[model samples]
Target: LGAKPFGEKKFIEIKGRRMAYIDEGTGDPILFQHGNPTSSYLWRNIMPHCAGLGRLIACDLIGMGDSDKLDPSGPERYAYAEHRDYLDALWEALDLGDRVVLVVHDWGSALGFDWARRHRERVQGIAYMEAIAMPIEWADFPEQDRDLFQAFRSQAGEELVLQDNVFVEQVLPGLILRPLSEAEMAAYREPFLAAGEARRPTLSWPRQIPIAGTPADVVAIARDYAGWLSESPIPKLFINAEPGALTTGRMRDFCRTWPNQTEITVAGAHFIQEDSPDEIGAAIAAFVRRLRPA
Candidate 1:
């Protein structure tokens, strides 16, 4: 299992802060966004498959990767709103032309979908897996993992994420079907280690999961984008994995009902990139080919 190592990093100033990314190829841009606790490196293996189709840009969300962390002193720092603002800024600064395709997973799904919802005319298509594409009820969450997620929203969760760093060290590995190479795991671990206590993003992500609508603002965003995803005529691709951690049965059926949706099932768990990057990449490439240029 060989992946093209993410080589050179290119940075752009967003709000006068360095935002890091890997920008490759040309033509209409294809943006890749990674989920919780993972960075743009997650797309290295997948990007090659879509190389000639378009410009591939995979960015480190706000604080999670090589991107600059804001001052820790700010109110609501590392909150979902904060991440969204920076992401919005980054998208604006890049001026991703008039058309783009989005490849996203996990929390990235929500962000990408929301962006597409607002900028419907600029988007060409979206390909996603294990997405937080909709709000979930506590009853629908996996029984086995439910308690742990509940704990994550509590004080104990803070200790585990900020102090113990389980999201990268334990949870990330646990979700993947295949054993991650030491180098792969090390790359994911490096940023959190560097961030130290500023690793609040990991803890903040869990609480923002939007179960039963406690976080009214995020849930509203999810609901609005979800409606747009359902009715929007743009091409959409949903890549599902076997025994996936998120993107459950109800969500699958809901997606099936969406207009212009294409679904592909690959063998893997939550972290399909490690188990099925080639397949995922192929699915995205196939989907991208169907989109009409703006």
Candidate 2:
């Protein structure tokens, strides 16, 4: 069969804002959480492969995709912690309880895993790809590229810099092993259609990265989440992309901390799904099956 339908679009109103999600197929629930600059659309190609095996729910985080955008004036409205609470509300509203597999990427890794940490008993397993789980030491950053991210993460202001199409063109595409197709590029561009309105979440994200000694909650959450990952007894897999900048030396340290953790390095970059969907999908399938009881 041709690519199966991504299922009907659905929404849940949390804190009076409507968040968009796609719920497809039926069986065990496999919840996919995406990271920055992309929406649930990130899993379009891979969803079909596993849809037949379980219920797949993918959500677009607020202000990132078709989800409701936060008021630009409201700084308190968007942050990693706030987003985590919103996800909790969404799950409660949808009545999605424990024992579901969480497929997470990038910043979504922190948010989704935080939820998993809180509800550890209910989480069946975790599949992480290009996600940040541990604190990032500035020393690990390449000298030249370090300042670039520091600017994006800690320095850029709404007035001075905004992640618009031009910024996306520069920062996002190159991080992937393969160049995004025109259609894929357009999908990413769709959310930031307006520069001024988009600047709120865009500019705030870099400021949220938890560098050592930073008073930011991102750092606190990273430390707590890393502690949780260390303690989690459930099966876990890290699907890392080669030739990518994110997840640097941290992956080895993460695996070392949780020696039972399975690590699979695939050919791709930060956007592993975009670069190698087939490899990722197959890896996920194998990992899930391995976790199943004989």
Candidate 3:
């Protein structure tokens, strides 16, 4: 709410809870959605290059930022299902156009794909990185990654995320290869400065990583999205960093073979936006421009 790098703060009541978002520029919308412990602030540097190009919008996923934050209790309350339901509600309230170019990362990528699948024709294009949009078969799920999540699912994880604000303080910074200034880091850390129960959303995401057939709902939705990912004719743009997250070497190769797809390899890590927002914004604008004629 204190940042104005993109635009003034705005809110819309989605299903009784107010959600924070930023809407700027003009022309068709290029909606940017953030991941864990980040808000519209994540898109600050990324929005300028697309200036005068389209209506650039960014939203803080409910429970993450200046939006409405309920002190959600109970393990079931913090699941992706609840987060995703709020997301669906936010979309209904935002009342966007019939189509949009989704610029997604982390959890946003998963939910964006779900929204796109629900209203496939409303999606003009998809530009994603650092998130899962493909089916995460067990063979593809890295053992280390699985073990990491399993550990995080333990009580020690609660002490780290819920008690210490580690997701925003430590984990988030570890993923970014570049150094963020004190002020920049503050933007992310500010929300969960007083962790305690406020850290439910952060705590839930890591544990929600589907293992085997568990987290059945997420796996089920991913299967539905997998069908769309392969068959949908919508324009796709993937900008991957060197040490990628979900967009691994194999997945990157798969994207290259898909229809109506474009790929860009940038020198960075998981949080590529922090390292190269200018490049990201430009690439996205160019991608969207190409689709404009179609």
Model 3, 6-72: lDDT tens digits are 7887998887888888988777788998887688898888887777767888888877878877654
* Candidate number of the best TM-score: 1
Residue-level lDDT of model 2, residues 1-294, one tens digit each, is 112326677987889889999988776778888887678888887776674667788988888777888774444557777787788888777656566888999888888878888888888889988777777778855455577667665435554446344345665776766656777777777778776757466655656666664646777778887887887788888886676566667655664576367778888767788777877787777777666544
Candidate 1 Cα outliers beyond 4 Å, as residue runs: 73-75, 194-196, 292-294
Listed per model in order, the count of residue pairs whose N, CA or C atoms clash below 3 Å is 0, 3, 0
Taking the tens digit of each residue's C-alpha lDDT, what string does model 1 give over 1-294? 664465477898887778888888778899999989898999889988886788889989988789987775222567777788888999888779878999999988889999898899999888889998888889767676788789878878867887789788888888888888888888888788843466777878888888988689889899999888889898889898888768777877777788888898998777789999999999898888777433
The lDDT, on a scale of 0 to 1, for candidate 2 is 0.73
TM-score, cand. 1 vs. native = 0.95
Candidate with the larger TM-score of 1 and 2: 1
Q: Would you list the rank order by TM-score, best first?
A: 1, 3, 2
Clashing pairs in 3: none
- Candidate 1 residue pairs that clash: none
Question: Model 3 scores what on Cα lDDT?
Answer: 0.78
